[PDB]
Design a protein around this ligand. Structure first.
Ligand code: NA
Ligand code: NA
Ligand code: NA
Ligand code: NA
Lengths: 125, 129
């Protein structure tokens, strides 16, 4: 029933605030503070959509994306980063990201982008 | 056969890339401006299009947006010598399927095209069943 979203960011403050916003909107949410943790969850649990930070402690969020997209091509993936670059944006595009947002992002904009991608997912089947 | 449109005002790039793609068995059409590109997209079927960004009549990112409205199912790969954070982020958000910085390695281009066309086939299967 409920749409399920994974948030991956080593900033636990961002995890907390983002989870609260998403849960209040009515989503079921899981959080992860490292790329390895995110990947383990993606392997074992279903998600409609994931939000990925890029500058993660244990590996670049772009590597996380690449693996996640191989595992779950149908899942939507939005990069959300305060470390945007030409290199990591081009990589994110090639690796399967569906959207790319630069921090700080406000709650309304984040929810609107998520809804848009979840709608597109439904129309795709 | 799979059909590809190449849009770039650099006619030497058009010609060389057409040659390479035809050798691989693709049917290819070419366009030297965004307008010509959009006119062809409106009037004939393509599986996939390659878009330059610095075109003379409009930016390749605008072309991408318009092309996506005309043919959302068509795959789109940006191929540019003028990559920037701004236009790569825009292309990602606007629905581009891949993005290649010149100078282009044909093996890389051919691999990305094949990957995107395989994905298109899987997508079509899903839409259908
Ligand atoms: Na980080
Ligand atoms: Na997808
Ligand atoms: Na994409
Ligand atoms: Na050009």
């Amino acid at each position: 029933s409920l749409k399920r979203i994974l948030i991956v960011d080593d900033d636990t403050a961002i995890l907390d605030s983002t989870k609260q916003i998403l849960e209040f909107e009515g989503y079921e949410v899981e959080i992860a503070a490292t790329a390895g943790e995110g990947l383990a969850k993606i392997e074992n649990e279903f998600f409609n959509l994931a939000l990925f930070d890029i500058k993660l402690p244990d590996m670049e969020g772009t590597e996380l994306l690449e693996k996640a997209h191989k595992l779950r091509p149908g899942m939507k993936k939005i990069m959300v980063t305060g470390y945007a670059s030409l290199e990591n944006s081009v990589f994110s595009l090639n690796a399967g990201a569906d959207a790319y947002i630069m921090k700080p992002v406000n709650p309304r904009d984040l929810l609107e982008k998520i809804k848009e991608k979840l709608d597109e997912q439904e129309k795709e089947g």
